[PDB]
A = this chain, B = another copy of it.
Amino acid sequence: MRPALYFCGSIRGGREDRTLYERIVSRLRRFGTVLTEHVAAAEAAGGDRLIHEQDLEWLQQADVVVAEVTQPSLGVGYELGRAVAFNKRILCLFRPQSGRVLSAMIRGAADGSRFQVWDYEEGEVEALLDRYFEADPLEENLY
């Protein structure tokens, strides 16, 4: 089976955050299955405990975790803490345009290898995801 990618963004993302999440998930599918694609596409049905166990099972199964961290979210932050504890390969994408500052706990978790945080402008997100996987692919290129 293809690689498993985990995409993580704020469930309270606004209209603009939502179009960016759809762009990121759509591009990630070129690299494998996006486990959270239906959640990104949508009492929460199934209830909070079920949701927590499902995202934990998907985080643990992931080959890579890609989080959009522009909007503050306890959920995105919690999933990044569980992902670092699972020693996963993590990429955070943050848009500095709003002038809001990314939490020091996320910027400060970066080690430039396994945990990376990249500032980006909305227009270049597809090109930056291609760059990230071209530098360290999940599947080897054909000859």
A residues near B, CB below 8 A? 10-12, 43-44, 46-53, 55, 69, 71-86, 101-110
Closest Cβ–Cβ distance, residue A69 to chain B (whole Å): 6
Q: How far is the CA of A42 from the CA of B84 in the complex (A)?
A: 28
- What is the CA–CA distance of A91 and B30 in the complex, to the nearest angstrom? 41
In the assembled complex, the Cα of A36 lies from the Cα of B35 at a distance in Å of 36
Contact A78 B103 (CB under 8 A): yes
Question: With a CB–CB cut-off of 8 A, which chain B residues contact A50?
Answer: 108
Which of B11, B52, B77, B82 contacts A74 (CB under 8 A)?
A: B77
* CB-defined contacts of A10 to chain B, threshold 8 Å: 72
B104 close to A52 (CB less than 8 A): yes
